[PDB]
From Swiss-Prot, chain A:
This is Large ribosomal subunit protein bL9. GO terms for molecular function: large ribosomal subunit rRNA binding; structural constituent of ribosome. Part of the 50S ribosomal subunit. In stalled/collided disomes (pairs of ribosomes where the leading ribosome is stalled and a second ribosome has collided with it) bL9 in the collided ribosome contacts bS6 and uL2, while it contacts only helices of the 16S rRNA in the stalled ribosome; the inter-ribosome bridge thus formed is different from that formed between normally translating ribosomes. It comes from Escherichia coli (strain K12). Transmembrane segments: none annotated. One of the primary rRNA binding proteins, it binds very close to the 3' end of the 23S rRNA. Belongs to the bacterial ribosomal protein bL9 family. GO terms for cellular component: cytoplasm; cytosol; cytosolic large ribosomal subunit. Keywords: Acetylation, Ribonucleoprotein, Ribosomal protein, RNA-binding, rRNA-binding. The keyword RNA-binding applies. The gene is rplI.
Curated annotation (Swiss-Prot), chain B:
Part of the 50S ribosomal subunit. Cross-links to the P and E site tRNAs. Belongs to the universal ribosomal protein uL1 family. It comes from Escherichia coli (strain K12). GO terms for molecular function: rRNA binding; structural constituent of ribosome; tRNA binding. This is Large ribosomal subunit protein uL1. Keywords: Repressor, Ribonucleoprotein, Ribosomal protein, RNA-binding, rRNA-binding, Translation regulation, tRNA-binding. NCBIfam families: rplA_bact (TIGR01169). GO terms for biological process: cytoplasmic translation; negative regulation of translational initiation; ribosomal large subunit assembly. The keyword Signal does not apply. The lineage of its organism: Bacteria, Pseudomonadati, Pseudomonadota, Gammaproteobacteria, Enterobacterales. CDD domains: Ribosomal_L1 (cd00403).
From Swiss-Prot, chain C:
InterPro entries: Ribosomal_bL28, Ribosomal_bL28/bL31-like_sf, Ribosomal_bL28_bact-type, Ribosomal_bL28_sf. GO terms for biological process: cytoplasmic translation; ribosomal large subunit assembly. The keyword RNA-binding applies. Part of the 50S ribosomal subunit. Pfam families: Ribosomal_L28. It comes from the Bacteria. HAMAP family: Ribosomal_bL28. Signal peptide: none annotated. This is Large ribosomal subunit protein bL28. The keyword RNA-binding applies. GO terms for cellular component: cytoplasm; cytosol; cytosolic large ribosomal subunit. The gene is rpmB. It comes from Escherichia coli (strain K12). GO terms for molecular function: rRNA binding; structural constituent of ribosome.
Length: 53, 134, 77
RNA sequence: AUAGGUUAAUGAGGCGAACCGGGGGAACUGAAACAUCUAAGUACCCCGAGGAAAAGAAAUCAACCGAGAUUCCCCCAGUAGC
RNA sequence: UUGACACUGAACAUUGAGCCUUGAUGUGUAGGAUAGGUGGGAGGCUUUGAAGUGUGGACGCCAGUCUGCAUGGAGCCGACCUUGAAAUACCACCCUUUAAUGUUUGAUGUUCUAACGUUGACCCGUAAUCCGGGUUGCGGACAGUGUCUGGUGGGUAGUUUGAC
């Protein structure tokens, strides 16, 4: 699903790169451990200036 | 023996990127910095099958500017190496040149037609670069 | 009871037609799966028996927005 | 921190002729046998509700003219169709 | 009971394909030419240090071109003639076949853990071998379950099995 990074994590992380990973991978590993951010409309806006720049 | 000269000229275009013809006609006048009157070697690719003899196009292209006639026929793989004039010709003389080949071929479009005609255009100016437009 | 706790899906009956059109009553079961959903607001996992489609409703609306309706209906977990 | 535990507050529970909405759902029979089909979503079963209940203000029809939520009644027609 | 999809993930390697740029690759008869092909049209090149040529990648229809550091050094070719075309003198599109890359899914291998399973241990809700929750170990994207689907199926059901 559409998810935006929060951490480093290799091969798919660069702190702020929207990746289309697999659902199970996002919902059971990246989201619960905070490794990523649920890429919903407002969270996309919450990143660009607050924790991106 | 491709070295610095043609490569600096190739820095103007990209083999992957497809531009518009309005850019290539002004860029080819900057592509050829040669000391002799050259031209452009365009290898336009067809949109139908050139194996079936009933559909192949062979004839003459109308160039109202002046040369004003260029004989063009299809190739083995299915292209036409029709020139679009000398490099010394100006912008609008080349703008109206490629449009002349377009509608002349579009209204003389063959019987068992299957789709829009012009798909790939391979503009290759004499001493210029490898340009890719539609 | 085989009921999706977020949508309201349940086994709806049907007909198991043969080639010769023999109507024999059958039953379409939802693809339910007990899953633990990590709620960050409560900083706690919430095991819920939901359908595969229900999971996709969660991925779209948001787990907390979904649980808003559950306490609104009393679908106590 | 929650799960949990105790007490207070408010409501519910059950019965009931049919009618109403919904969840399930026959066979006999007809077909001159019988399996598609019919019987019939009827019988029966379960839940909920009111005094009526349900539906209900068009992402509806019509027809290039117009009508304007739903429900019930009489035709349309045993026709168009299946 | 079989396979597909769903719950269902991650890397790593190998292996098919696609794709980006790409160096190569492409002898009719002719031939200085391993001219693919069409090929616009006669100068490239360069003193951001060259050919000849040793060896080598290379291709190897073995008729050969290209040529990685290169002492060498400032030139190395042409167009053109014997070609149905004119040529790695400069030459694109980049394709038939190659190879590399980023990427993209497919199928196999190997490991991992975080979904999922745990009728393993332990603590608590509690004076309960229920259940739930928490720790932890073990398995682990298998297993198992839903939808579709081929096979099997007298286990079960509805029925037929003519008249003379």
């Amino acid at each position: 699903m559409q998810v935006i990074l929060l951490d480093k994590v290799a091969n798919l992380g660069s702190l702020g790169d929207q990746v289309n990973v697999k659902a199970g991978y996002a919902r059971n590993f990246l989201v619960p451990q905070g490794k990523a951010v649920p890429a919903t409309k407002k969270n996309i806006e919450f990143f660009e200036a607050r924790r991106a720049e | 023996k491709l070295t610095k000269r043609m490569r600096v000229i190739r820095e103007k275009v990209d083999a992957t990127k497809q531009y518009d013809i309005n850019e290539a006609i002004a860029l080819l006048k900057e592509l050829a910095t040669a000391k002799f009157v050259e031209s452009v070697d365009v290898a336009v690719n067809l949109g139908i099958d050139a194996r079936k003899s009933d559909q192949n196009v062979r004839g003459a292209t109308v160039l109202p500017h002046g040369t004003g006639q260029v004989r063009y026929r299809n190739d083995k793989n299915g292209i036409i190496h029709t020139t679009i004039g000398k490099v010394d010709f100006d912008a609008d003389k080349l703008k109206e040149n490629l449009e002349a080949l377009l509608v002349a071929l579009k209204k003389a479009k063959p019987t068992q037609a299957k789709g829009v005609y012009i798909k790939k255009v391979s503009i290759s100016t004499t001493m210029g670069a490898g340009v890719a437009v539609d | 009871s085989r009921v999706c706790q977020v949508t309201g899906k349940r086994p709806v009956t049907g007909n198991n037609r043969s080639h010769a059109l023999n109507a024999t009553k059958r039953r379409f079961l939802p693809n339910l799966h007990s899953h633990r959903f990590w709620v960050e607001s409560e900083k706690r996992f919430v095991t819920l028996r939901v359908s595969a489609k229900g999971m996709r409703v969660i991925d779209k609306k948001g787990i907390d927005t979904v649980l808003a309706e559950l306490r609104a209906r009393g679908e106590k977990y």
